[PDB]
Amino acid sequence: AWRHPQFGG
Amino acid sequence: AWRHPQFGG
Amino acid sequence: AWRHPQFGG
Amino acid sequence: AWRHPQFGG
Amino acid sequence: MEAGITGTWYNQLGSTFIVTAGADGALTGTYESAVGNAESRYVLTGRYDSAPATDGSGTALGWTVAWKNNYRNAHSATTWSGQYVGGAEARINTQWLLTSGTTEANAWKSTLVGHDTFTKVKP
Amino acid sequence: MEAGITGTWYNQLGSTFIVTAGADGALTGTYESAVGNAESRYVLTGRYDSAPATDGSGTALGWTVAWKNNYRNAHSATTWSGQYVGGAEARINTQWLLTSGTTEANAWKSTLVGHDTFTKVKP
Amino acid sequence: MEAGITGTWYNQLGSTFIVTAGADGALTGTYESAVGNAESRYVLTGRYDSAPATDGSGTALGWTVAWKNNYRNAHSATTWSGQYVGGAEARINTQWLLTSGTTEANAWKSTLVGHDTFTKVKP
Amino acid sequence: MEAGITGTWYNQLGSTFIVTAGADGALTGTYESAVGNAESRYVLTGRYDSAPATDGSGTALGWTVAWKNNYRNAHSATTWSGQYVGGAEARINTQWLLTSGTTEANAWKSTLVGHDTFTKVKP
């Protein structure tokens, strides 16, 4: 759900 | 998160 | 090796 | 085709 | 035609896959991750190689289940891709892709990957 | 029902995907990796979410093609798993699994993975 | 050794991949999905074919990033598997697997799959 | 740090994975699909979550092996993505992607997908 760091999260 | 139906959810 | 039909083979 | 080293090749 | 595909298959999680292999290469049936539970029952359609090599190679096949029935809609679909291997210990080895409908920003988490092995004997 | 799925789709390699989306959630059609070439034409069947979320999420779907027709048999099957995204630039984004029938010893090389993007406009 | 791998690469989402290709076949560097943002920076390690075929084939490679740094821990790891293709439009085409640490019951949703294309030119 | 990862692991095919888990989150070691056979031995590097959740979730990790050593070059690389699950029956469950260097026309068959389960006990 929450923006994973791989995708700019 | 919630049990998807594929897995007995 | 040989062109599979999925790829125009 | 030939046994790739990953699989004991 | 592929003789031993038609019938009831079970994965290692308890799910039941009931399929009919048509002479035309059509796979038709239902998937239920529960015990005869109607709310857990979904329609499946697929295709299989109806004239496989005779050299002992397996029979390639694939099917899809959209996770929507009269009781629920999980806005997702799973495709299983694999092969049937006959014998006393018949089995269908597969790899699957479960895609959920997402917005553009959430597309990175749209697809899960896993694998399943089905046998003709209960779990 | 999913309005804009029925029709002709093209991937970036030239392949043509012709499909009819049934009100029941059924996908039926043909896949041809050539130009109206009958020997390159194969039957496909799949399923799609016929009542997708309205929040802008895509429409999950999946289909299978067994690579056998009246001219050839490649002893393999491909399943595409993905979602339909409507709009002026409609597109079906997918990930696929191509499994070939193999012997037990050769099972390690049975499944290839890749991805395809289909649009309604020629290649 | 593979001459043109060392350097800065960008995917289509904005992420930056900074890598050094060792003569030994070692890939070492950092991945940042932001603009020089230290909290978005993670360590990567991988391997590549240091003596690729000369026939125009690409250079196979792979790397892993565990999503934990001094500012955050996402309890997950991503592996990218692909190949480097040289030329004026150099590019690294990959497929990735993002696995999250889960409990046994939640293992079905542990792994996501996708693909990325990196170029040497800004986004 | 992840206590029980360092050591010798075996997959179900006989392959041996020897790894050292660094306090920094580094995985370093060798993969051999044979019995102490030097020509079958390849270097691996990866990363793992060195501070996993304590709630019983597994420890995410990933590693890469480029298939080139002093005896052979298969012009390919495999990345394994998965998680470590401790206990009396410790195991590392993974999914892998094997990419071979190909020409542009042959890129469709560049990547194979599969899965492996490693245990600390011989095959």
Side-chain angles (χ1 to χ4, degrees):
Chain A
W2 109 121
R3 250 307 191 285
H4 184 279
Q6 178 174 156
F7 312 98
Chain B
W2 109 121
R3 250 307 191 285
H4 184 279
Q6 178 174 156
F7 312 98
Chain C
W2 109 121
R3 250 307 191 285
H4 184 279
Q6 178 174 156
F7 312 98
Chain D
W2 109 121
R3 250 307 191 285
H4 184 279
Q6 178 174 156
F7 312 98
Chain E
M1 179 53 179
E2 186 57 81
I5 288 178
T6 292
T8 305
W9 297 88
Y10 303 97
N11 72 355
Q12 316 311 135
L13 300 187
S15 301
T16 294
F17 162 40
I18 296 164
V19 67
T20 284
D24 54 350
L27 289 185
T28 290
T30 56
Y31 182 98
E32 37 193 273
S33 306
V35 294
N37 182 19
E39 36 236 319
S40 77
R41 178 173 306 149
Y42 298 79
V43 170
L44 70 89
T45 189
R47 302 287 296 165
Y48 74 108
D49 175 2
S50 50
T54 39
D55 72 343
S57 283
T59 302
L61 48 47
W63 70 89
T64 302
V65 175
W67 302 103
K68 168 173 144 46
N69 63 16
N70 293 319
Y71 305 83
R72 192 206 292 223
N73 194 344
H75 302 296
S76 51
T78 300
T79 57
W80 282 257
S81 183
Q83 61 184 312
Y84 162 78
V85 168
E89 206 291 305
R91 100 201 75 109
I92 298 180
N93 301 120
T94 63
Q95 280 185 289
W96 53 259
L97 291 177
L98 168 53
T99 299
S100 299
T102 63
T103 56
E104 305 323 289
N106 272 166
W108 59 271
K109 58 171 311 181
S110 66
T111 316
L112 292 165
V113 62
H115 51 86
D116 258 327
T117 296
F118 298 84
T119 61
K120 315 187 103 317
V121 180
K122 255 286 185 68
Chain F
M1 179 53 179
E2 186 57 81
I5 288 178
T6 292
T8 305
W9 297 88
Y10 303 97
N11 72 355
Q12 316 311 135
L13 300 187
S15 301
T16 294
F17 162 40
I18 296 164
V19 67
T20 284
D24 54 350
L27 289 185
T28 290
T30 56
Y31 182 98
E32 37 193 273
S33 306
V35 294
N37 182 19
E39 36 236 319
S40 77
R41 178 173 306 149
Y42 298 79
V43 170
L44 70 89
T45 189
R47 302 287 296 165
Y48 74 108
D49 175 2
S50 50
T54 39
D55 72 343
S57 283
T59 302
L61 48 47
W63 70 89
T64 302
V65 175
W67 302 103
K68 168 173 144 46
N69 63 16
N70 293 319
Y71 305 83
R72 192 206 292 223
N73 194 344
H75 302 296
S76 51
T78 300
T79 57
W80 282 257
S81 183
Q83 61 184 312
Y84 162 78
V85 168
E89 206 291 305
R91 100 201 75 109
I92 298 180
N93 301 120
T94 63
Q95 280 185 289
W96 53 259
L97 291 177
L98 168 53
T99 299
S100 299
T102 63
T103 56
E104 305 323 289
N106 272 166
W108 59 271
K109 58 171 311 181
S110 66
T111 316
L112 292 165
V113 62
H115 51 86
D116 258 327
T117 296
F118 298 84
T119 61
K120 315 187 103 317
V121 180
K122 255 286 185 68
Chain G
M1 179 53 179
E2 186 57 81
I5 288 178
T6 292
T8 305
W9 297 88
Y10 303 97
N11 72 355
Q12 316 311 135
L13 300 187
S15 301
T16 294
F17 162 40
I18 296 164
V19 67
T20 284
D24 54 350
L27 289 185
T28 290
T30 56
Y31 182 98
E32 37 193 273
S33 306
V35 294
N37 182 19
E39 36 236 319
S40 77
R41 178 173 306 149
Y42 298 79
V43 170
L44 70 89
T45 189
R47 302 287 296 165
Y48 74 108
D49 175 2
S50 50
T54 39
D55 72 343
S57 283
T59 302
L61 48 47
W63 70 89
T64 302
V65 175
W67 302 103
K68 168 173 144 46
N69 63 16
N70 293 319
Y71 305 83
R72 192 206 292 223
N73 194 344
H75 302 296
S76 51
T78 300
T79 57
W80 282 257
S81 183
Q83 61 184 312
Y84 162 78
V85 168
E89 206 291 305
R91 100 201 75 109
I92 298 180
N93 301 120
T94 63
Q95 280 185 289
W96 53 259
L97 291 177
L98 168 53
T99 299
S100 299
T102 63
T103 56
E104 305 323 289
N106 272 166
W108 59 271
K109 58 171 311 181
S110 66
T111 316
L112 292 165
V113 62
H115 51 86
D116 258 327
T117 296
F118 298 84
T119 61
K120 315 187 103 317
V121 180
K122 255 286 185 68
Chain H
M1 179 53 179
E2 186 57 81
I5 288 178
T6 292
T8 305
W9 297 88
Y10 303 97
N11 72 355
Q12 316 311 135
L13 300 187
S15 301
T16 294
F17 162 40
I18 296 164
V19 67
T20 284
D24 54 350
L27 289 185
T28 290
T30 56
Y31 182 98
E32 37 193 273
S33 306
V35 294
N37 182 19
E39 36 236 319
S40 77
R41 178 173 306 149
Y42 298 79
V43 170
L44 70 89
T45 189
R47 302 287 296 165
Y48 74 108
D49 175 2
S50 50
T54 39
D55 72 343
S57 283
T59 302
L61 48 47
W63 70 89
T64 302
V65 175
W67 302 103
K68 168 173 144 46
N69 63 16
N70 293 319
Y71 305 83
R72 192 206 292 223
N73 194 344
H75 302 296
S76 51
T78 300
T79 57
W80 282 257
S81 183
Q83 61 184 312
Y84 162 78
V85 168
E89 206 291 305
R91 100 201 75 109
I92 298 180
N93 301 120
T94 63
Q95 280 185 289
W96 53 259
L97 291 177
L98 168 53
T99 299
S100 299
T102 63
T103 56
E104 305 323 289
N106 272 166
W108 59 271
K109 58 171 311 181
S110 66
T111 316
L112 292 165
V113 62
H115 51 86
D116 258 327
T117 296
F118 298 84
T119 61
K120 315 187 103 317
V121 180
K122 255 286 185 68

